[PDB]
Paper text:
The major capsid protein (VP1) is composed of a shell (S) domain and a protruding (P) domain, and the P domain is further divided into the P1 and P2 subdomains. The P2 subdomain is the main determinant of NoV diversity, antigenicity, and glycan binding patterns. In conclusion, GII.13/21 huNoVs have developed a novel GBS that interacts with glycans via the common β-Gal through a unique glycan binding mode.
OIF P domain was reported to bind Lea antigen but the GII. These included a single mutation (N297Y or G361E) and a double mutation (N297Y/G361E), aiming to restore the Lea binding function. Unexpectedly, oligosaccharide-based binding assays showed that all mutant P domains retained their original pattern of binding to Lec/lac/mucin core 2 glycans and did not bind to Lea antigen. Also, the single mutant N297Y and the double mutant N297Y/G361E showed stronger binding signals to all Lec/Lac/mucin core 2 glycans and particularly to mucin core 2, while E361 showed the same binding affinity for the glycans as the native P proteins. We determined the crystal structure of the SC1065/2016 N297Y mutant. Y297 in the crystal structure of an SC1065 N297Y mutant displayed an orientation opposite that in GII. SC1065/2016 to Lea by reverse mutation of residues 297 and/or 361 failed.
Residue numbers in the entry:
A (entry chain C), B (entry chain A): 3 to 311
Write the structure that this text describes.
């Protein structure tokens, strides 16, 4: 039986699985009213990708396809007829919530659309268009293969093969950024399908442990931080996919260790569905040694008692 | 002794190590007048990172720091005084060619600068500034901890903590995109230092094999492609770093296989310094089967004679 392992990576060597930026810190908090059901960065410990999860950070919140004119709409002047960010054709009957890498938070995603290359004499950055992709728009239906593009300053051409590169997130006065409210992948008139399950602590005193990043915010949240919290770093997703080690229990005991001193800084529970819990009550940003990393200890029973941290 | 392995990844499951976009195909050509000395995606088979190579694709061609106003009527309206991912000033005495992840191609890099968050009422994408970072500017001195920012869209504010997210590449009438001309990391008046070595075939009939991507081009190259070719995909760099398997010969004989049939499509030499050669004469794009992947076969010496492909 292939033993289960974690990659040996420090907190500065991890990528957020829900937005293509590095992990900044570990963070724990109670769920209070949030339903924690993100769809990117979802992978079982034995290597089954779930939700909209794929292997490349450069595909997370990225889109590719062909633009379609949508003149007359207030918000979305054009649509993007999607494929997978792979470039492989997208079939709405695929058993996924949306094309892999589709944004899994509610609100406005900001990025740059690139289209057919233009001549040098056309001018600077004339094949770059700043664009909003909002999930509250009626045209956000990636499950059906089409999303709406809100142009900001630059003209988006119809009928051109186009690539959307994410840059950050946005918040205006009627569209709050809500990282734990799933989009309606098929529009407000249809239920989501093929979702990775919601996660929550099930042992007394435990809280979810998140891998936290601050995403750039191009509008709103003055003096505040746009946080995107993921359950697994992209590197863990890819490691579990590569290894496909059979899971021997619902929960694995893991430790954050200093490899030079051998000290366990804290213990945590790694759950089969692909998330972590720690024994703590309250919102708490962890600070962890630059050389520290998680290590797999053993498979334990669901009601194993972690050392408080 | 820890056996050497490659990750099991198809061509579309690989990330370019020189720009955060997926690999699309393989490519081989003679060096003729190109000095092949890229500094990102450089890693020995036993896991030693070289040049400016680090582990996160989300850090390649990404920059962070504090803006400083630049006087005069010239190309760069602002400078970016660089900082580590923690916010501490960069150290020019580090034995590296430049901060890790610095762009290693000459020409114009395009992306979006984000700064202090602005209120919701300030307007759409008002904390997003489209920007050119040109290596032919006298202000491109990342080794010294400062790069020049040419504003295109939105005003860049000085004295603000800022992040640069890369989107693509550009070419105007006097700045060609030259992927094999290393930038002068300390400006045009200083020699590069601490470089990973240039690579070339040394066995008769062999050519370098590259992992090839098409990078978005926001100005120029109409009807043409901006290619970025790397020696190793980011996933191979990270795998070798993780495994740190001792190299047992000068060359790891590797084989591209189609798992549906078990058939070998071609074989290649994976040199212990971290680059691939194949037996071929001429420029040739390799459209590889989408389900295929490289596999490590065995250790051989530098005088192994590859089967021509």
């Amino acid at each position: 039986t292939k033993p289960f392992t974690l990659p040996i990576l420090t907190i500065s060597e991890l990528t957020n699985s829900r937005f293509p930026i590095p992990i900044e810190q570990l963070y724990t908090a109670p769920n209070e009213n949030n339903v924690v059901q993100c769809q990117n960065g979802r992978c079982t410990l034995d290597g089954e990708l779930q939700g909209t999860t794929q292997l490349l950070s450069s595909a997370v919140c990225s889109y590719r396809g062909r633009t379609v004119a949508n003149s007359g709409d207030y918000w979305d002047q054009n649509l993007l007829q999607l494929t997978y960010p792979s470039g492989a054709s997208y079939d709405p009957t695929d058993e996924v919530p949306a094309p892999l890498g589709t944004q899994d938070f509610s609100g406005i995603l900001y990025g740059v659309l690139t289209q057919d290359n233009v001549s040098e004499g056309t001018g600077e950055a004339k094949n770059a268009k700043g664009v909003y992709i909002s999930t509250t728009s009626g045209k956000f239906t990636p499950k059906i293969g089409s999303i709406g593009l809100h142009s900001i300053t630059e003209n988006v051409h119809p009928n051109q093969q186009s690539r959307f590169t994410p840059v950050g997130v946005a918040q205006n006065e009627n569209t709050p950024f809500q990282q734990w409210v799933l989009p309606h992948y098929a529009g407000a008139l249809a239920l989501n399908t093929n979702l990775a399950p919601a996660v929550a602590p099930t042992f007394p005193g435990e809280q979810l442990l998140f891998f936290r990043s601050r995403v750039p915010c191009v509008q709103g949240l003055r003096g505040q931080d746009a946080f995107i919290d993921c359950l697994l770093p992209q590197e863990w997703v890819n490691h579990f996919y590569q290894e496909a080690a059979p899971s021997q229990a619902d929960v694995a005991l893991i430790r954050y260790v200093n490899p030079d001193t051998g000290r366990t800084l804290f213990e945590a529970k790694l759950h089969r569905s692909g998330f972590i819990t720690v024994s703590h009550t309250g919102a708490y940003p962890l600070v962890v040694p630059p050389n520290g990393h998680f290590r797999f200890d053993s498979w334990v029973n669901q009601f194993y008692s972690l050392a408080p941290m």
